[PDB]
Design a binder for this molecule. Structure first.
Ligand SMILES: C[C@H](CCC(=O)NCCC[N+](C)(C)C[C@H](O)CS(=O)(=O)O)[C@H]1CC[C@H]2[C@@H]3[C@H](O)C[C@@H]4C[C@H](O)CC[C@]4(C)[C@H]3C[C@H](O)[C@]12C
Ligand SMILES: C[C@H](CCC(=O)NCCC[N+](C)(C)C[C@H](O)CS(=O)(=O)O)[C@H]1CC[C@H]2[C@@H]3[C@H](O)C[C@@H]4C[C@H](O)CC[C@]4(C)[C@H]3C[C@H](O)[C@]12C
Ligand SMILES: [Mg+2]
Lengths: 1319, 66, 502
DNA sequence: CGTCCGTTCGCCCGTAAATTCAGA
DNA sequence: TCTGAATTTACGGGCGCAACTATGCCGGACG
RNA sequence: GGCAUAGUUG
């Protein structure tokens, strides 16, 4: 069944595979991230609660007082979103916090404090996220882009062959905290362990171990095993572990108990290892040459001298053994330093470093961190204690602790925020283990090692940054506080927090201007995962490792949607089904496979969990019970695709679209497109301009409705019901009694947003798509916005295309467009431009906005009113005066339309500073706006009252119904009625109480609206009044505009061909667009040819329906043909039936299908070629997809039948009238008298360095000389050249460029005397 | 090499307009170097005829009539 | 003082506006945005414009289409001069007002000042000296420049949204340098080698390949023609096919004498299209130059021989005529692209089955311990490469001899008239590798680490790649895009160093 | 509102300085 | 125990061209 | 009208 919005126009679905998981709310990431920032969290884990609990309570350095925390609250925003956009303010809510200040007197640790005081202090505002995932920051709409940064924790890397020029890989380890300093351990070609903090000077690693109060002997005992030499009788019979004997060369004869295990000189074999293990060998005799290279573990002293004889970590020789022989020491501990498995790295590090005691380590660290300062014991101790071991200056977050414990093979995942001795020790031991040969380094690009910072998380970090300053100020103030006089309002400074949050939201690398020219553009800007930003990479630094596609990007990051250019692969886009883990990692759904049956339950797996599993591919054939039909299925085990058994499979892909994003899933036949062309197609689909009328892609993918609805541009019905009233700018829905809450009646009013400016100067305009008295259900579109047709995304228009060369007018990449396309006004777009005229309080007098302007006639000022502001609806062109303004000396400084720009003034807004005596036009605008507000409030009140009286009348039909004399009494006199004793009279009283509340709130809101409209406006400092004029230009089409398709097929229009010159088929229908066949082989986007053929089939179905419909036929034949069309497919799973449409929905559906049958081709489960042939054969169209075409001009038939069809062409936002520029003479820069840059400034083209080389390669010495002297910066030369050109003499005086004089002055401004010596 | 040969040029303006402006200018200032601007980049920077194409005749004329 | 003279050289660069190291004197005289490389070596110039380029195939090689509004804005001083000369404005304010109102008389002035005043057209990455060329303006009722198709190869300019800048040579020496040195008709040969640079690119070569071709039996096979004019009269009236083997009478001129053209008439066995093209070739060239299939290299060498024998002006006229006739007959061919033109070999499935059986047997040989991992990997890679080569050979044969046409007796093989095959063989667009991925398997793919994958993509683009194969192709494509982006900078730095040294 | 003074994390290469061999 | 060569290490240079759109700002703090 | 940031075009 279909809920009356998918029953008007059913898109034919060629998807074989059945869907399992519904496509989620695509804007879930932004909304869910910001929701756990403002909402109250009792546990205190998320949001502002976490920040407040982390900062508060605030004490002093001494035990004087303490300011603690109670709760926070977000007040109601002062301005609505629309009002916020109109005025130019930020859309924010005041953050009011309850604080209690307690004061501690002499000896009151647990006793009652002197006084307590709780007040709701105000500390700044936080911008609020609109219901579409966007913010309004200064009247513009911005999006905070999610960041894909490097997860906190410990990582191990190699640095394979970039150093030592020998191929010896190093092994470094980095401990990245969420907020703190970096600790890096490293190796060197000499195999010594080194440490560094914040990537400063490389000091030895054991220095930090000593700074942790570890002596040399315990360090060696911690990083090494002990070999025991006991001098029992003689020759130092050594206690031996049989396991330690594998891998070395025996220099002596290993014999014991009359059984020579190893002969002299020979190595140690595995056979002898087994024999030693099974013979229970513990102590063996050793020679004298063996101890000569060993290192003593700990220290020893003599009994005579009583002092040190041999310090720890010193190579034992015959002298040391002889000296300790007489001391009485028989048990000697030595280090086991194997050559290949247990290296002596800590020993060599202890040798190299000059530190011996803890104070020396601390002072060395202090000198490294702070260079040149006089170091002190106390200062060094404090610095090292606050480096990694203080909760203020260092904090591993929960993710940092989890990754730290996982990478060290720990048991628990929850621990302390700060580091400890054991953590650093374990990191060093793990790095040494990696060096020895056990374990492998981590890959930084792995998606199990990269988090997702989002808007809420970054906003709360910035809030913490702001709160830290406020905490410091409060700590400082508590020592100078007049305690029993003030409340915690003057204690808190609301400026730092607000400044920090406004700096983050307004001027940041991730809170960026929203790309709003297309619903797809918005919905893919919100789901953008950027690797740059604060705490991330930079496009001039990262390369070749984060740019490429990683095998863990499957199902989490789109492989084809990434901006080509400066940052490819740094601005990845989130996949369709990808969610964010609890810790911030990207996870993707999978269907569980317990037995051979594929269970219908979904588990979200992240990258590390997915690494050890076998996941069957999405295109795996299954039966009704659910089983892999093949006995060997294609899966991927550990980042590697292969073939696996029918039983081993553990998970399966939920859907075949889960690898691509919402921009790359709108490309029909993506699987036939080359990856580069698909990338271009997605990135250009982002840039389509909303045309006059959307045109419902004939060949879609089925994701159009999801993208159109999930992005907020339509009017989706909140509660189902019956449409009561539909005008162009408002829809009224009477909710069904089943969905109506007990109490308020209870109908929905949707105020459509008519023609308004987007961020890209396009048109946003919602149009109703429902008629009066038409039932709607919950979640149905009521108004389709820009680039939307009946709730389906519709960017471009689908036009009849022919692939053939045409006299070179589609030579390389060009398009050829008929005059029928420009006559039907189907690529005509509306562009709304905002022009501001500001009257600034300047010196020598203020600026007036009067209509009395000199130097102009009355015909020029005839379009203005008496107040000097153009009328609404005037067709002003380039050069017309929009807003008359003069500035004192008087001179004309009026706001005029820029040259070349036409259009109609559609809306004029006047902003006046308080107390400036607004003129007549501002008064007219404000009185008409107040009347409009009163009209809107009265209309909503009377609509609600009509609904309320309807509900009362419906209630009054049972239990004492009165229908004859009910209208005799006035409808307002319904409080003194007659009724029995039941809850119905209580419901009537509830309705009356809600009506009284409506009346009171209506009066209050009318007064509030009058106050908010008549009041002054908070303008910039120095401006008197601002007048904003909104022109509505209409750009039709012209040679030069760049049109494209969905498969990376670009092309600028080269000619607007006459209707009778285009090629036509046998029926006389001309093709709308001619394309070049030669672009298909080289750029392997075969998907456009298949889209052409399938669109031809769809339009053939539509033409058949149109023929059967225009000459009236019975509904039986019509429904028979529609059912045959919808039942055409190999193993499709749509299965729509027409026996349940009741002969009035079949007619509506056929009316909607008479312009072609919409067809859904899933992104990788799409229509096969054979099905396209069958659908073409269903109409009267050839199977091959090519028809003979006749030349328009000559009339002769083109041989080699050409490929004709219907391609869904888009009009990108690269228009030639916005690209064309020219300049003869204009303004010139100040420092260098060279022409300005750009075209917004009337600037000149840059004849750059390579152009100078190109002229030098010719013999053009005079052309170059006039290029870089007369035409650029020779002031006298250029004035003389202009005078000579006007005089008709083309000759230049060379002169000398002014920029050379500037360079001479700048070099002379150093201590360098540079001059031009005399001739 | 091309960069070492283009920095070790008797005319210091070409080397200054190439990489390492600071070092080249420091060397030229300390050594008191004098530039005859007899190349193509120097005359571009100064803003006169390039001694290559139609400007070769002019440069020859100014050498003959020095 | 040390921060004023060179901020940040000592260390701890001072910042003034929200942690941003400020520019000192050294920063203002050095770097990419100093005075040398930003304001002295390259400057912004007056009398300059910029617009999106389109095709305009009707243009002659020495001229370009310039919009009326761009020309009016660029030549404003000249228009003022002519208006004052003709007495239409005593002062310059009146002339400025007349021009900004765009009266009916300023357009005649613009047309008579455009007459023979070249304009320099330049595309943004001016890699070589052919990246800026002088053309004669033709006033166009539009907003987009019309760039002659032949110069696109020299500019490396397609028409997918490129923009080009126009500069107006003011002084007489500049105009004469543009006409005598930088004209598009003077830049026939590339300065890097001897080969021509105005070679017809893609549609002209397709038209000339389709026109100069033959099939085993067509309309008017074997009829005797009295000359190229009768060949054109037969083709245009429908009495003979464009490519039909006929005997024509060709009178070719050989200038092996002391610069004198010597006539020689013969009966050449050729096709109708070859004679029609012979109507274009100038007098000095032999008829053997158009008796072949005329791919892209053939047209290149035809232009090269024309330049070497006849000179500059005949070569320019010949190139313009070649472009015109190639566009005309490429349109006449209707050479489209379909889904059935990418013929999949019937033996692809069995070859893939054999390769899969062989990899299964190699896996069996490895799991038993007969071979190690490295040699198994090498064996699998080699056998998949062999299977890919066999598939490519099969598809190439099936597309080369796709047509087996006869109705008067025995079947005869001929070079196929397939659209994809003709576009690839003529040299117009595509190559063997691309047509291979269109029909045959696209073969082995490499991981981002650079190592080859054992399992290739056994699916072409006519068939649908599944998710894994497409993901691996995305690996390969992202690597190439990143390499191109990071290689353009290295090439630019190398060429800047080469320019500076010499 | 009018005024008014103080964040490490890339790759490659050439070059000068610090370090280490390797003697007599 | 002095002294020169070779090695290693720290550090400063460099890292394509042209074009368009938008916002934020040029400073945060005492009378 | 200068810088920075972000996005985009070839
Ligand atoms: C309690 C919750 C998981 C519940 C089990 C843990 C697991 C990961 C923690 C977040 C991350 O660390 C990132 C970030 C670090 C900041 O410093 C504070 C905020 C953030 C969002 C943390 C809040 C909270 O602590 C999280 C969500
Ligand atoms: C059918 C519907 C009653 C349903 C029970 C009747 C009763 C109240 C009527 C509307 C209200 O007057 C408000 C508004 C006034 C405008 O001026 C004209 C339009 C509006 C929407 C009216 C149209 C319609 O007539 C309404 C919805
Ligand atoms: Mg291009």
């Amino acid at each position: 069944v279909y809920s009356y919005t998918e029953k008007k126009r059913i898109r034919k679905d060629f998807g074989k595979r059945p869907q399992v998981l519904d496509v989620p709310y695509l804007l879930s990431i932004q909304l869910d991230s910001f929701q756990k920032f403002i909402e109250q969290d009792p546990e205190g884990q998320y949001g502002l609660e976490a920040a407040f609990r982390s900062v508060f309570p605030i004490q002093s350095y001494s035990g004087n007082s303490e300011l603690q925390y109670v709760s926070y609250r977000l007040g109601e925003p002062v301005f609505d979103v629309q009002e916020c956009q109109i005025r130019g303010v930020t859309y924010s809510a005041p953050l009011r916090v309850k604080l209690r200040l307690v004061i501690y007197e002499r000896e009151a640790p647990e006793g009652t404090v002197k006084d307590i005081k709780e007040q709701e202090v105000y500390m700044g505002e936080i911008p609020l996220m609109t219901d579409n995932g966007t913010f309004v920051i200064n009247g513009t709409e911005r999006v905070i882009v999610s960041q894909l940064h490097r997860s906190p924790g410990v990582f191990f890397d190699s640095d394979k062959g970039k150093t030592h020029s020998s191929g010896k890989v190093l092994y470094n380890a980095r401990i990245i905290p969420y907020r703190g300093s970096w600790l890096d351990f490293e190796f060197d070609p000499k195999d010594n362990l080194f440490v560094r903090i914040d990537r400063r000077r490389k000091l030895p690693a054991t220095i930090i171990l000593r700074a942790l109060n570890y002596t040399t002997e315990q360090i060696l005992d911690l990083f090494f095993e002990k070999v025991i030499f006991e001098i029992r009788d003689n020759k130092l019979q050594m206690e031996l572990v049989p396991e330690r004997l594998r891998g070395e060369t025996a220099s002596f004869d290993i014999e014991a108990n009359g059984k020579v295990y190893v002969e002299k000189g020979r190595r140690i074999t595995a056979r002898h290892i087994r024999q030693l293990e099974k013979d229970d060998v513990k102590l063996i005799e050793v020679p004298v040459e063996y101890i000569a290279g060993k290192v003593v573990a700990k220290d020893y002293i003599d009994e005579s001298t009583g002092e040190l004889i041999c310090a720890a970590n010193m190579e034992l020789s015959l002298d040391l053994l002889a000296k300790l022989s007489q001391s009485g020491h028989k048990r000697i501990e030595t280090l086991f330093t194997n050559d290949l498995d247990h290296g002596p790295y800590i020993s060599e590090t202890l040798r190299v470093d000059p530190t011996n005691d803890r104070l020396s380590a601390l002072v060395e660290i202090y000198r490294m961190m702070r260079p040149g300062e006089p170091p002190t014991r106390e200062a060094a101790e404090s610095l090292f204690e606050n480096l990694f071991f203080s909760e203020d200056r260092y904090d591993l977050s929960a993710v940092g602790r989890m990754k730290f414990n996982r990478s060290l093979l720990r048991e628990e995942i929850e621990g302390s925020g700060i580091l400890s001795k054991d953590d650093i020790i374990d990191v060093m031991k793990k790095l040494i283990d990696i060096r020895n040969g056990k374990g492998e380094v981590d890959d930084i690009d792995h998606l199990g090692n990269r988090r997702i910072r989002s808007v809420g998380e970054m906003a709360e970090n910035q809030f913490r940054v702001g709160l830290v300053r406020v905490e410091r100020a409060v700590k400082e103030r508590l020592s100078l506080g007049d305690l029993d006089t003030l409340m915690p309002q003057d204690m808190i400074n609301a400026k730092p927090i607000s400044a920090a949050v406004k700096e983050f939201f307004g001027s940041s690398q991730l809170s960026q201007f929203m790309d709003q020219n297309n619903p797809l553009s918005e919905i893919t800007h919100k789901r953008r995962i950027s690797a740059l930003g604060p705490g991330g990479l930079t496009r001039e630094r990262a390369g070749f490792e984060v740019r490429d596609v990683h095998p863990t990007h499957y199902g989490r990051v789109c492989p084809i949607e990434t901006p080509e250019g400066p940052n490819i692969g740094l601005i990845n886009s989130l996949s369709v089904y990808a969610q964010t883990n609890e810790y911030g990692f990207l996870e993707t759904p999978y269907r569980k496979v317990t037995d051979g049956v594929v269970t219908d339950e979904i588990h979200y797996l992240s990258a590390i969990e997915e690494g050890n599993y076998v996941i069957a591919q999405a295109n795996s054939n299954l039966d009704e019970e659910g089983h892999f039909v093949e006995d060997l299925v294609t899966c991927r085990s550990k980042g590697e695709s292969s073939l696996f058994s029918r039983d081993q499979v553990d998970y399966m892909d939920v859907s075949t679209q889960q690898v691509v994003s919402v921009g790359a899933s709108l490309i029909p036949f993506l699987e036939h497109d080359d990856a580069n062309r698909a990338l271009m197609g997605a990135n250009m689909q982002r840039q389509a301009v909303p045309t006059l009328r959307a045109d419902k892609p004939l060949v879609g993918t089925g994701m159009e409705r999801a993208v159109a609805v999930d992005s907020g541009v339509t009017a989706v019905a909140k509660r189902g019901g019956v449409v009561q009233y539909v005008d162009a700018s408002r829809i009224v829905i009477k909710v069904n009694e089943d969905e109506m809450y007990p109490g308020e009646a209870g109908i929905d009013i949707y105020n459509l947003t008519k023609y308004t400016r987007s961020n890209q100067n396009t048109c946003i305009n919602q149009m109703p798509c429902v008629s009066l008295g038409e039932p709607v259900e919950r979640g149905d579109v009521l108004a389709d916005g820009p680039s939307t047709d009946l709730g389906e995304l519709a960017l471009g228009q689908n036009m009849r295309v022919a692939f053939m060369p045409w006299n070179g007018y589609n030579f390389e990449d060009s398009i050829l467009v008929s005059e029928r396309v420009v006559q039907e006004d189907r690529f005509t777009t509306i562009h709304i431009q905002e022009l501001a005229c500001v009257s600034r309080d300047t010196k020598l007098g203020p600026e007036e906005i009067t209509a009395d302007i000199p130097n102009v006639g009355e015909a020029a000022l005839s379009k203005l009113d008496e107040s000097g502001i153009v009328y609404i609806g005037a067709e002003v062109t380039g050069g017309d005066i929009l807003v008359g303004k003069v500035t004192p000396k008087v001179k004309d400084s009026s706001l005029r339309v820029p040259n070349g720009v036409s259009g109609t003034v559609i809306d004029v807004q006047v902003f006046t500073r308080d107390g400036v005596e607004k003129d007549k036009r501002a008064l007219e605008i404000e009185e008409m706006q107040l009347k409009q507000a009163k009209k809107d409030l009265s209309e909503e009140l009377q609509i609600l009252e009509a609904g309320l009286f309807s509900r009362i009348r419906a209630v009054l039909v049972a239990g004492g119904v009165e229908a004859e004399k009910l209208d005799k009494l006035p409808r307002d006199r319904w409080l003194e009625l007659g009724l029995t004793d039941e809850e119905k009279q209580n419901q009537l009283e509830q309705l009356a109480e809600q009506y009284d509340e409506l009346k009171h709130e209506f009066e209050k809101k009318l007064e509030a609206k009058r106050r908010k409209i008549t009041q002054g406006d908070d303008l910039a400092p120095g401006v008197l009044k601002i007048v904003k004029v909104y022109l509505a230009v209409k750009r039709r089409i012209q040679p030069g505009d760049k049109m494209a398709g969905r498969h990376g097929n670009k092309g600028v229009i080269s000619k607007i061909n006459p209707i009778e010159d285009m090629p036509y088929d046998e029926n006389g229908t001309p093709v709308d667009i001619v394309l070049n066949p030669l672009g298909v082989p080289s750029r392997m986007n075969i998907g456009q040819i298949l889209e052409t053929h399938l669109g031809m089939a769809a339009k053939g179905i539509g033409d058949k329906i149109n023929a059967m419909l225009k000459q009236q036929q019975e509904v039986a034949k019509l429904r028979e043909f529609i059912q045959r069309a919808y039942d055409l497919g190999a193993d499709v799973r749509q299965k729509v039936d027409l026996s349940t449409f009741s002969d009035e929905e079949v007619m509506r559906l056929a009316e909607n299908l008479r312009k072609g049958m919409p067809i859904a081709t899933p992104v990788f489960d799409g229509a096969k070629e054979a099905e396209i042939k069958e659908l073409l054969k269903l109409g009267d169209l050839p199977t091959s997809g090519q028809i003979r075409l006749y030349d328009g001009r000559t009339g002769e038939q083109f041989e080699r039948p050409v490929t004709v069809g219907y391609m869904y062409m888009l009009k990108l936002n690269h228009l030639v009238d916005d690209k064309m520029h020219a300049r003869s003479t204009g303004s010139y820069s100040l420092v260098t008298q060279q022409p300005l840059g750009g075209k917004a400034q009337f600037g000149g083209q840059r004849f750059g360095e390579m152009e100078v080389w190109a002229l030098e390669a010719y013999g053009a010495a005079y052309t170059l000389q006039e290029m870089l002297t007369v035409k650029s910066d020779d002031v006298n030369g250029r004035t003389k050249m202009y005078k000579n050109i006007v005089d008709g003499n083309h000759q230049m005086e060379p002169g000398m460029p002014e920029s050379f004089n500037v360079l001479l002055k700048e070099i002379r401004s150093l201590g360098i005397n540079i001059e031009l010596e005399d001739e | 090499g091309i960069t070492k040969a283009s920095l070790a040029t008797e005319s210091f303006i070409s080397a200054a307009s190439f990489q390492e402006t600071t070092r080249v200018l420091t060397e030229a200032a300390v050594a008191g170097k004098r530039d005859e601007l007899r190349g193509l980049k120097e005359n571009v920077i100064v803003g006169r005829l390039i001694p290559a194409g139609t400007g070769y005749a002019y440069h020859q004329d100014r050498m003959r009539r020095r | 003082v040390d921060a004023l003279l060179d901020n940040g050289r000592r260390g701890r660069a001072i910042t003034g506006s929200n942690k941003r190291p400020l520019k000192s004197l050294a920063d203002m005289i050095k770097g990419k945005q100093g005075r040398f490389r930003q304001n002295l070596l390259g400057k912004r110039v007056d009398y300059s414009g910029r617009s999106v380029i389109t095709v305009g195939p009707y243009l002659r090689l020495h001229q370009c289409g310039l919009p009326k509004k761009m020309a009016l804005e660029l030549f404003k001083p000249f228009i003022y001069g002519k208006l004052e000369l003709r007495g239409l404005a005593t002062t310059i304010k009146a002339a400025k007002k007349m021009v900004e109102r765009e009266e009916a008389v300023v357009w005649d002035i613009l047309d008579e000042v455009i007459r023979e005043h070249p304009v320099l057209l330049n595309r943004a990455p001016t890699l070589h000296r052919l990246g800026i060329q002088a053309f004669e303006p033709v006033l166009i009722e539009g907003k987009a420049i019309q760039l002659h198709p032949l110069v696109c190869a020299a500019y490396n300019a397609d028409f997918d949204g490129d923009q080009m800048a126009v500069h107006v040579p003011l002084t007489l020496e500049a105009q004469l340098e543009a006409r005598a040195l930088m004209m598009s008709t003077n830049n026939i040969l590339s300065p890097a080698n001897g080969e021509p640079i105005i070679v017809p690119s893609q549609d002209v070569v397709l038209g000339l390949y389709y026109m100069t071709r033959d099939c085993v039996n067509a309309k008017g096979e074997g009829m005797v023609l009295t000359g190229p004019k009768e060949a054109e009269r037969l083709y245009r009236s429908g009495l003979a096919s464009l490519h039909a083997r006929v005997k024509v009478r060709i009178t070719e001129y050989e200038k092996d004498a002391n610069g004198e053209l010597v006539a020689k008439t013969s009966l050449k066995d050729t096709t109708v299209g070859r004679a029609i093209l012979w109507m274009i070739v100038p007098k000095g060239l032999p008829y053997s130059i158009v008796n072949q299939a005329l791919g892209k290299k053939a047209i290149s060498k035809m232009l090269n021989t024309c330049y070497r024998i006849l000179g500059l002006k005949p070569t320019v006229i010949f190139a313009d005529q070649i472009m015109y006739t190639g566009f005309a007959y490429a349109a006449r061919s209707g050479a489209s692209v379909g889904i059935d033109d990418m013929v999949i070999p019937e033996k692809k499935h069995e070859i893939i089955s054999e390769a899969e059986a062989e990899v299964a047997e190699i896996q069996e040989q490895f799991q038993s311990g007969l071979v190690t991992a490295g040699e198994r990997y090498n064996k699998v890679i080699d056998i998949w490469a062999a299977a890919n080569d066999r598939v490519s050979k099969a598809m190439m044969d099936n597309l080369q001899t796709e047509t087996v046409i006869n109705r008067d007796g025995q079947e005869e093989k001929q070079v196929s008239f397939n659209s994809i095959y003709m576009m690839a063989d003529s040299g117009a667009r595509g190559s063997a590798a691309q047509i291979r991925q269109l029909a045959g398997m696209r073969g082995l793919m490499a991981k981002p680490d650079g190592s080859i994958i054992e399992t290739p993509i056994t699916a072409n683009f006519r068939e649908g790649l599944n998710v894994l194969q497409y993901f691996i192709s995305t690996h390969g494509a992202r690597k190439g895009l990143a390499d191109t982006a990071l290689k353009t900078a290295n090439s630019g730095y190398l060429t800047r160093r080469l320019v500076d040294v010499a």
